[PDB]
Structures are given as C-alpha cells and as structure tokens.
Design a protein around this motif. Sequence first.
Motif, PDB file in Angstrom:
ATOM      1  N   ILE A   1       3.041  -7.985  39.691  1.00 35.99           N
ATOM      2  CA  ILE A   1       2.169  -6.870  40.147  1.00 35.99           C
ATOM      3  C   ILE A   1       1.031  -6.851  39.125  1.00 35.99           C
ATOM      4  O   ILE A   1       1.292  -6.857  37.941  1.00 35.99           O
TER       5      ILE A   1
ATOM      6  N   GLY B   1      -0.588  -2.507  37.849  1.00 37.17           N
ATOM      7  CA  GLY B   1       0.427  -1.477  38.204  1.00 37.17           C
ATOM      8  C   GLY B   1       0.929  -0.769  36.954  1.00 37.17           C
ATOM      9  O   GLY B   1       0.295  -0.793  35.904  1.00 37.17           O
TER      10      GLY B   1
ATOM     11  N   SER C   1      -0.224  -7.309  44.460  1.00 40.04           N
ATOM     12  CA  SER C   1       1.127  -7.851  44.202  1.00 40.04           C
ATOM     13  C   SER C   1       0.699  -9.325  43.832  1.00 40.04           C
ATOM     14  O   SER C   1      -0.463  -9.704  43.970  1.00 40.04           O
TER      15      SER C   1
ATOM     16  N   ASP D   1       6.504 -11.554  43.190  1.00 43.72           N
ATOM     17  CA  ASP D   1       6.735 -10.262  43.892  1.00 43.72           C
ATOM     18  C   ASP D   1       7.157 -10.554  45.345  1.00 43.72           C
ATOM     19  O   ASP D   1       7.699  -9.688  46.009  1.00 43.72           O
TER      20      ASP D   1
END
Length: 223
Positions: A1, A4, A172, A176
């Motif tokens: 990610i 994030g 992403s 992921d």
Amino acid sequence: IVGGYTCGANTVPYQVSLNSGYHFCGGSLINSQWVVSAAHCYKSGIQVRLGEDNINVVEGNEQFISASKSIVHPSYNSNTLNNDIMLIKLKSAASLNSRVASISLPTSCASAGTQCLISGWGNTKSSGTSYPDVLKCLKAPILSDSSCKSAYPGQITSNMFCAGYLEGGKDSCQGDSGGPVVCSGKLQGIVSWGSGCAQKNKPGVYTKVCNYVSWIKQTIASN
Ligand SMILES: [Ca+2]
C-alpha cells in the motif's frame, strides 16, 4: 500500500495472508472455511494465515490452515485479468472471534463516490521497494466508470472498477494483490491490477465482487 497508514493489530479481522513459504498475496475470509482472493494469485501449496498483524513474528492471534482446494473462476483470462477472482476452501474451519472474523458479501454494487478501506502487506514505495512487516491501510473512493475507462482505454470490463486518486500518491501495489476493498461493511473489491503504483492518472483496478455473488454462493454450497 503506498501512502497509507498502519492499520493497527487485528483491526481488519477478515484480512488473510496467503503463504507458500513466504507471503505472496492477500485474501478475505468470507466464512469459517472459505477465502476469496484474486485468480492471478493462484498456485499449489497455499497455507492461509489468519489473525496476522506482523507476518514475520508469531504474536499470538494467528491461525495457519492449509487449503484443501482452490477454484479459479471458470472465465478467468490471465491476459486481460477479466474475472480475476478465486475461492480457497480451508482444510478445517477457522475459529472466529473479534480479531478473526468474516466479511459479508454485498447485496448491491457500490457506486462511484463511495469511500472504501483497502489493506495489505504489499510494497509501500512507488519507485523502489520496501515491504512492511505489519498491515497497512488506505481509505480511497470508488471512481466513476468514465474516469476509469479514460485512464485505461480498451482495458476495463464490466467486472472491474477503479478506486483511488487520479493525482497519484496513494494506491495498493505489488503484494496487496488478492486483498480486500471493503465499503460500508461489505466486500466490494479484490486488489487486481494497475500500471505501476500510485502514478498520476493510473488508479488501481479492482475485481467487482457484486457480479460474482451467485457464483460464490453456489460454489460454496456444493464443495
Ligand atoms: Ca505474526
């Protein structure tokens, strides 16, 4: 990610890590014996790891269960990634509590504008690599189909949706794949593909789970 935040241990209880000697894809627990992931994550010898936060340290809430069988969608096309979804049945049922729980399948498709939660142990850099040991999270909106097709001309089918930021910076990424996109407490997507990660005008593309609910339900009922 990329871009994030650290979710926090077991705050995403349906997140699973698919391991074949190492973590290679994410997935979502939909009931005590079944996991949904991306068909491109298929391989033999998969062990599903539930209750994980740091995938390199046994912290106490883990359940490691081997898969008894994998079922890739009948119409999966690895060249276009259309119907990028697969079901994994566990050898034994997992024990569900607050830290390990299943996520509900959707009754309706989500609309563009809806904010969702995407999580995983994938790469956190857009250039270069750095893989995290603990789970990362990202809140992102589903984009309009017009924006999605305009960013990926000739590549989006009715079984895909884009979610993310056209400005880039948050997305992403590799690792992921197979993981969840949850919106309003329902599993609406599976991390599928994208051009690079977090690049401007190249948002992430996700498998549109609402289109597979009948297949999921019928398959689980007969296997
Ligand atoms: Ca661990």
